[PDB]
Amino acid sequence: YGDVAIVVYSGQYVENGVKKNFLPDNTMVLGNTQARGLRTYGCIQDADA
Amino acid sequence: MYTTAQLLAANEQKFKFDPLFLRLFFRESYPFTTEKVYLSQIPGLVN
């Protein structure tokens, strides 16, 4: 759409018994692809590990 | 009785019939050998 791309996401996550959409019915997110996001993982608190 | 008639060509009056479904979706067949036929479908739903 000029400099900004347009992306539609209809992903779904499954609850205990119901399937619900990740995003609500009508939202948009002004974002950047170069925005840095963290994927930090903690320490495994298992004796065997 | 004294007719002396010739006969020209004849029409056919065909249908307007073309499956489009046994040729686009049902491409595979499976003959039976028994009476009952099962069809399972695994349900996908996770906590």
Curated annotation (Swiss-Prot), chain A:
Similarity comment: Belongs to the lambda phage major capsid protein family.
The protein's role, per its UniProt record: Assembles to form an icosahedral capsid with a T=7 symmetry. The icosahedral capsid is about 60 nm in diameter and composed of 415 major capsid proteins. The assembly is primed by the interaction between capsid assembly protease and portal dodecamer, and major capsid proteins assemble cooperatively to form the procapsid with the help of capsid scaffolding protein. Major capsid protein forms hexons and pentons of the icosahedron. Viral genomic DNA is packaged into the procapsid through the portal vertex.
Subunit structure: Homomultimer. Interacts with FI protein.
Compartments where located: Virion; Host cytoplasm
Full-protein residues shown: 245 to 293 of 341
Superkingdom per UniProt: Viruses
The protein's name in its UniProt record: Major capsid protein
